[PDB]
Design an enzyme around this catalytic site. Structure first.
Site, PDB file in Angstrom:
ATOM      1  N   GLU A  19       6.560 -11.572  17.430  1.00  0.00           N
ATOM      2  CA  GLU A  19       6.353 -10.997  16.122  1.00  0.00           C
ATOM      3  C   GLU A  19       5.734 -12.033  15.215  1.00  0.00           C
ATOM      4  OE1 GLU A  19       6.354  -8.178  14.836  1.00  0.00           O
ATOM      5  OE2 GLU A  19       7.466  -6.942  16.296  1.00  0.00           O
ATOM      6  N   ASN A  22      -0.957  -5.114   6.558  1.00  0.00           N
ATOM      7  CA  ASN A  22      -1.432  -3.964   7.279  1.00  0.00           C
ATOM      8  C   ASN A  22      -2.471  -3.236   6.474  1.00  0.00           C
ATOM      9  OD1 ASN A  22       1.939  -3.820   7.666  1.00  0.00           O
ATOM     10  ND2 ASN A  22       0.611  -4.025   9.469  1.00  0.00           N
ATOM     11  N   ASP A  48      -2.676  -0.386   5.615  1.00  0.00           N
ATOM     12  CA  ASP A  48      -2.160   0.652   4.718  1.00  0.00           C
ATOM     13  C   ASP A  48      -1.560   0.097   3.439  1.00  0.00           C
ATOM     14  OD1 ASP A  48       0.369  -0.377   5.137  1.00  0.00           O
ATOM     15  OD2 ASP A  48       1.166   1.411   6.149  1.00  0.00           O
ATOM     16  N   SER A 104       1.047  -2.029   3.172  1.00  0.00           N
ATOM     17  CA  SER A 104       2.348  -2.655   3.420  1.00  0.00           C
ATOM     18  C   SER A 104       2.122  -4.044   4.001  1.00  0.00           C
ATOM     19  CB  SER A 104       3.183  -1.819   4.379  1.00  0.00           C
ATOM     20  OG  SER A 104       2.473  -1.577   5.588  1.00  0.00           O
ATOM     21  N   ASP A 138       4.204  -7.147   6.565  1.00  0.00           N
ATOM     22  CA  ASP A 138       5.352  -7.546   7.392  1.00  0.00           C
ATOM     23  C   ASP A 138       5.663  -8.990   7.101  1.00  0.00           C
ATOM     24  OD1 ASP A 138       5.283  -4.900   8.722  1.00  0.00           O
ATOM     25  OD2 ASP A 138       3.504  -5.690   9.727  1.00  0.00           O
ATOM     26  N   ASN A 143       8.875  -4.805   7.644  1.00  0.00           N
ATOM     27  CA  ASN A 143       7.849  -4.086   6.869  1.00  0.00           C
ATOM     28  C   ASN A 143       8.341  -3.685   5.502  1.00  0.00           C
ATOM     29  OD1 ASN A 143       6.570  -1.030   6.374  1.00  0.00           O
ATOM     30  ND2 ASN A 143       5.126  -2.648   6.899  1.00  0.00           N
ATOM     31  N   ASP A 169      19.326   1.741  12.901  1.00  0.00           N
ATOM     32  CA  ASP A 169      18.694   2.885  12.303  1.00  0.00           C
ATOM     33  C   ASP A 169      18.635   4.091  13.225  1.00  0.00           C
ATOM     34  OD1 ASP A 169      17.423   3.801   9.803  1.00  0.00           O
ATOM     35  OD2 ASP A 169      15.546   3.866  10.960  1.00  0.00           O
TER      36      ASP A 169
END
EC number: 3.2.1.17
Lengths: 129, 89
Positions: free
Chosen positions: A35, A46, A48, A50, A52, A59, A101
Protein backbone atom coordinates in the site's frame (compact mmCIF):
# COMPACT_ATOMS: atom_id res chain seq x y z
CA UNK A 1 8.94 7.47 8.82
CA UNK A 2 10.00 4.48 6.76
CA UNK A 3 9.57 1.46 9.04
CA UNK A 4 11.72 -1.68 8.94
CA UNK A 5 9.78 -4.84 8.13
CA UNK A 6 10.41 -6.38 11.53
CA UNK A 7 10.14 -3.05 13.30
CA UNK A 8 6.61 -2.59 11.92
CA UNK A 9 5.71 -6.21 12.68
CA UNK A 10 6.55 -5.52 16.35
CA UNK A 11 4.75 -2.16 16.16
CA UNK A 12 1.66 -3.85 14.77
CA UNK A 13 1.66 -6.71 17.27
CA UNK A 14 1.86 -4.24 20.10
CA UNK A 15 -1.10 -2.38 18.71
CA UNK A 16 -3.20 -5.53 18.65
CA UNK A 17 -3.38 -6.35 14.96
CA UNK A 18 -2.25 -10.00 15.28
CA UNK A 19 -5.27 -12.15 14.53
CA UNK A 20 -7.55 -9.14 14.78
CA UNK A 21 -10.67 -10.38 13.00
CA UNK A 22 -8.72 -13.58 12.25
CA UNK A 23 -6.08 -11.90 10.07
CA UNK A 24 -2.66 -12.97 11.37
CA UNK A 25 0.11 -10.38 11.63
CA UNK A 26 1.70 -11.31 8.29
CA UNK A 27 -1.36 -9.96 6.46
CA UNK A 28 -1.00 -6.55 8.03
CA UNK A 29 2.72 -6.29 7.32
CA UNK A 30 2.10 -7.47 3.84
CA UNK A 31 -0.57 -4.85 3.21
CA UNK A 32 1.63 -2.04 4.54
CA UNK A 33 4.41 -3.18 2.22
CA UNK A 34 2.30 -2.88 -0.90
CA UNK A 35 0.00 0.00 0.00
CA UNK A 36 2.72 2.40 1.13
CA UNK A 37 6.18 0.77 0.90
CA UNK A 38 6.18 1.16 4.71
CA UNK A 39 6.26 4.98 4.42
CA UNK A 40 3.99 6.57 7.07
CA UNK A 41 4.00 9.76 5.04
CA UNK A 42 2.75 8.13 1.86
CA UNK A 43 -0.20 9.98 0.29
CA UNK A 44 -1.89 9.38 -3.07
CA UNK A 45 -4.51 11.47 -4.84
CA UNK A 46 -7.13 9.57 -6.77
CA UNK A 47 -8.65 10.94 -9.94
CA UNK A 48 -11.96 11.37 -8.11
CA UNK A 49 -10.60 13.93 -5.66
CA UNK A 50 -10.24 11.62 -2.64
CA UNK A 51 -6.78 10.86 -1.23
CA UNK A 52 -5.30 7.80 0.47
CA UNK A 53 -3.18 8.66 3.49
CA UNK A 54 -0.50 6.84 5.49
CA UNK A 55 1.01 3.41 5.99
CA UNK A 56 -2.33 1.67 5.18
CA UNK A 57 -3.57 4.22 2.66
CA UNK A 58 -6.88 4.97 4.28
CA UNK A 59 -9.26 6.82 1.85
CA UNK A 60 -10.67 10.22 2.65
CA UNK A 61 -14.19 9.83 1.29
CA UNK A 62 -15.65 7.73 4.15
CA UNK A 63 -12.83 7.11 6.56
CA UNK A 64 -11.06 10.34 7.49
CA UNK A 65 -11.58 14.02 6.97
CA UNK A 66 -9.20 16.11 4.89
CA UNK A 67 -11.63 18.93 4.04
CA UNK A 68 -10.97 18.66 0.30
CA UNK A 69 -13.53 16.02 -0.71
CA UNK A 70 -17.23 16.72 -1.09
CA UNK A 71 -19.92 14.90 0.94
CA UNK A 72 -17.29 13.21 3.14
CA UNK A 73 -18.24 11.01 6.11
CA UNK A 74 -15.54 10.70 8.80
CA UNK A 75 -16.33 7.24 10.20
CA UNK A 76 -12.92 6.95 11.91
CA UNK A 77 -13.44 10.43 13.49
CA UNK A 78 -9.98 11.86 12.76
CA UNK A 79 -8.25 14.30 10.43
CA UNK A 80 -6.24 12.76 7.64
CA UNK A 81 -2.97 14.31 8.87
CA UNK A 82 -3.27 12.13 11.99
CA UNK A 83 -2.59 9.27 9.56
CA UNK A 84 0.78 10.71 8.41
CA UNK A 85 2.56 10.53 11.73
CA UNK A 86 5.35 8.23 12.94
CA UNK A 87 3.00 6.94 15.64
CA UNK A 88 0.88 4.38 13.76
CA UNK A 89 -1.77 4.31 16.53
CA UNK A 90 -4.29 6.38 14.54
CA UNK A 91 -3.73 4.38 11.34
CA UNK A 92 -4.15 1.19 13.32
CA UNK A 93 -7.28 2.32 15.08
CA UNK A 94 -8.76 3.28 11.71
CA UNK A 95 -7.70 -0.04 10.09
CA UNK A 96 -9.59 -1.84 12.89
CA UNK A 97 -12.85 -0.05 12.02
CA UNK A 98 -12.34 -0.65 8.30
CA UNK A 99 -11.54 -4.38 8.56
CA UNK A 100 -14.67 -4.69 10.80
CA UNK A 101 -16.85 -3.11 8.13
CA UNK A 102 -18.06 -6.46 6.73
CA UNK A 103 -15.46 -7.18 4.02
CA UNK A 104 -12.44 -7.99 6.18
CA UNK A 105 -9.14 -7.11 4.50
CA UNK A 106 -10.85 -6.87 1.10
CA UNK A 107 -10.99 -3.15 1.76
CA UNK A 108 -7.36 -2.95 0.52
CA UNK A 109 -6.46 -3.25 -3.18
CA UNK A 110 -2.84 -4.05 -2.40
CA UNK A 111 -3.71 -6.82 0.05
CA UNK A 112 -6.16 -8.21 -2.43
CA UNK A 113 -3.74 -8.06 -5.39
CA UNK A 114 -0.59 -9.19 -3.65
CA UNK A 115 -1.05 -10.76 -0.22
CA UNK A 116 -4.38 -12.61 -0.15
CA UNK A 117 -4.03 -16.34 -0.59
CA UNK A 118 -0.22 -16.19 -0.34
CA UNK A 119 2.15 -17.44 2.34
CA UNK A 120 1.62 -14.30 4.43
CA UNK A 121 3.50 -15.51 7.52
CA UNK A 122 6.62 -15.15 5.36
CA UNK A 123 6.35 -11.47 6.25
CA UNK A 124 7.10 -12.09 9.91
CA UNK A 125 9.85 -14.60 9.14
CA UNK A 126 13.17 -13.77 10.87
CA UNK A 127 11.50 -11.36 13.33
CA UNK A 128 12.36 -11.53 17.02
CA UNK A 129 8.73 -11.56 18.14
CA UNK B 1 -16.35 -16.15 -17.76
CA UNK B 2 -19.11 -13.56 -18.15
CA UNK B 3 -22.15 -13.90 -16.03
CA UNK B 4 -25.35 -12.19 -14.92
CA UNK B 5 -26.42 -12.10 -11.26
CA UNK B 6 -29.44 -10.56 -9.64
CA UNK B 7 -30.65 -9.79 -6.09
CA UNK B 8 -30.74 -7.32 -3.25
CA UNK B 9 -27.98 -5.15 -1.79
CA UNK B 10 -26.85 -6.53 1.60
CA UNK B 11 -24.09 -4.00 2.28
CA UNK B 12 -22.10 -1.24 0.59
CA UNK B 13 -18.47 -0.35 1.30
CA UNK B 14 -16.39 2.47 -0.03
CA UNK B 15 -12.67 2.08 0.50
CA UNK B 16 -11.54 4.54 -2.17
CA UNK B 17 -9.96 2.51 -4.96
CA UNK B 18 -12.16 -0.48 -4.15
CA UNK B 19 -15.89 -0.26 -3.75
CA UNK B 20 -17.75 -3.46 -2.77
CA UNK B 21 -21.43 -4.26 -3.13
CA UNK B 22 -22.70 -7.45 -1.59
CA UNK B 23 -25.54 -9.04 -3.52
CA UNK B 24 -27.81 -11.60 -1.87
CA UNK B 25 -30.43 -14.00 -3.29
CA UNK B 26 -34.09 -13.81 -2.21
CA UNK B 27 -33.97 -16.42 0.58
CA UNK B 28 -30.67 -15.35 2.22
CA UNK B 29 -27.46 -17.34 2.71
CA UNK B 30 -24.35 -16.41 0.71
CA UNK B 31 -23.83 -12.83 -0.41
CA UNK B 32 -21.45 -12.45 -3.32
CA UNK B 33 -18.95 -9.55 -3.34
CA UNK B 34 -18.97 -7.33 -6.42
CA UNK B 35 -15.73 -5.34 -6.72
CA UNK B 36 -15.46 -1.93 -8.34
CA UNK B 37 -11.77 -1.11 -8.72
CA UNK B 38 -10.59 2.34 -9.87
CA UNK B 39 -7.99 1.03 -12.28
CA UNK B 40 -10.32 -1.43 -13.95
CA UNK B 41 -14.07 -0.80 -13.53
CA UNK B 42 -15.76 1.31 -16.29
CA UNK B 43 -16.34 4.91 -15.17
CA UNK B 44 -20.14 5.05 -15.19
CA UNK B 45 -20.53 2.23 -12.64
CA UNK B 46 -19.07 4.48 -9.94
CA UNK B 47 -21.96 6.91 -10.49
CA UNK B 48 -24.44 4.06 -9.93
CA UNK B 49 -22.53 2.78 -6.93
CA UNK B 50 -23.17 6.22 -5.42
CA UNK B 51 -26.93 5.75 -6.08
CA UNK B 52 -27.19 2.33 -4.45
CA UNK B 53 -28.58 1.76 -0.97
CA UNK B 54 -29.38 -1.25 1.19
CA UNK B 55 -32.09 -3.67 0.00
CA UNK B 56 -32.09 -2.28 -3.56
CA UNK B 57 -32.59 -4.91 -6.20
CA UNK B 58 -29.80 -5.11 -8.80
CA UNK B 59 -29.09 -7.04 -11.99
CA UNK B 60 -25.35 -7.11 -12.47
CA UNK B 61 -23.38 -8.25 -15.51
CA UNK B 62 -19.67 -9.09 -15.11
CA UNK B 63 -16.82 -11.59 -14.84
CA UNK B 64 -16.94 -14.20 -12.08
CA UNK B 65 -13.73 -15.51 -10.57
CA UNK B 66 -12.78 -17.68 -7.62
CA UNK B 67 -11.40 -15.80 -4.62
CA UNK B 68 -7.72 -16.16 -3.90
CA UNK B 69 -7.04 -18.13 -0.73
CA UNK B 70 -8.77 -21.02 1.00
CA UNK B 71 -11.81 -19.00 2.04
CA UNK B 72 -13.31 -20.57 -0.94
CA UNK B 73 -16.10 -18.56 -2.59
CA UNK B 74 -16.63 -16.37 -5.72
CA UNK B 75 -16.00 -12.74 -6.76
CA UNK B 76 -17.58 -10.65 -9.50
CA UNK B 77 -16.07 -7.83 -11.57
CA UNK B 78 -18.98 -5.87 -13.06
CA UNK B 79 -19.28 -4.35 -16.52
CA UNK B 80 -22.87 -3.22 -15.94
CA UNK B 81 -25.15 -2.63 -12.98
CA UNK B 82 -28.90 -2.10 -13.26
CA UNK B 83 -31.29 -1.14 -10.41
CA UNK B 84 -34.71 -2.81 -10.50
CA UNK B 85 -36.68 -1.66 -7.43
CA UNK B 86 -39.08 1.30 -7.26
CA UNK B 87 -37.21 4.64 -7.55
CA UNK B 88 -36.93 6.92 -4.47
CA UNK B 89 -38.62 10.35 -4.49
Amino acid sequence: KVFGRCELAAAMKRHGLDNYRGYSLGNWVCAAKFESNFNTQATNRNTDGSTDYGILQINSRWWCNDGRTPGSRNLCNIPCSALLSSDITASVNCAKKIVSDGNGMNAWVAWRNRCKGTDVQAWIRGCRL
Amino acid sequence: TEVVVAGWVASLGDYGRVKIVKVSDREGGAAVPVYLEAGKTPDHLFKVFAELSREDVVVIKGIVEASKGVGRGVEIFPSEIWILNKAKA
